[PDB]
């Protein structure tokens, strides 16, 4: 019985040592690719800003055209009392677009498998 238990515990200790080294290396690798993401984030933020603002401007121009006949409609009138920037709702950005873009924007990531 001693020999069996000893072989078992030795096997476990070898496995623990190996996994310790391997998981430390994996954590270093994760830090490295996280830092790549960090170095890349400003460019993504800049172009995301420009993309959002361009979609909002296009919607604003199309809404100036569409809502000219209705009598008392301010084009581009906010629904908030505050004057600070509000992150656009998904519907506002893609409100006047095709169902394929709306589907890709709402459920594209959830459904990707």
């Amino acid at each position: 019985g001693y020999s069996m238990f000893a072989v078992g515990i030795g096997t476990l200790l070898f496995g623990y040592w190996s996994m310790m080294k391997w998981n430390r290396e994996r954590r270093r690798l994760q830090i490295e690719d996280f830092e790549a993401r960090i170095a890349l984030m400003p460019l993504f933020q800049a172009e995301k800003d420009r993309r959002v603002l361009q979609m909002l401007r296009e919607n604003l121009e199309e809404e100036a055209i569409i809502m000219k006949d209705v009598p008392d409609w301010k084009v581009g009138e906010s629904v908030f009392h505050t004057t600070r920037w509000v992150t656009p709702m998904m519907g506002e950005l893609y409100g006047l677009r095709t169902n394929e873009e709306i589907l890709s924007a709402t459920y594209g990531f959830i459904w990707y498998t």
């Binding site: 430390r24 270093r28 830090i31 996280f34 960090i38 984030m41």
Partner: protein
């Protein structure tokens, strides 16, 4: 001393599963407080940059904040590479 000896003897003879279970549970409870690497695990968790490090507005009174990543100030992960 001799009461618990024969007690653990009878337990190892009658219920080795419960003996091993209580041994493993007790080890799991007490060993983490005696380890020098628990702090290493806390530090490893703290060194993982999940979100963007927002820069600080320099006011001329920050001698210990880097002005470029490769500058010598700021935290170092050298201890981690040799770990």
């Amino acid at each position: 001393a001799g009461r618990i000896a024969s007690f653990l003897k009878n337990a190892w003879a009658k219920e080795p599963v419960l003996v091993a279970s209580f041994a493993i549970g007790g080890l799991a409870i007490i060993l983490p407080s005696l380890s020098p690497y628990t702090n290493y695990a806390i530090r490893i968790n703290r060194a993982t940059p999940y979100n963007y490090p927002v820069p600080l507005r320099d006011d001329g009174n920050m001698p210990d904040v880097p002005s470029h990543p490769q500058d010598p100030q700021g935290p170092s992960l050298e201890w981690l590479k040799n770990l």
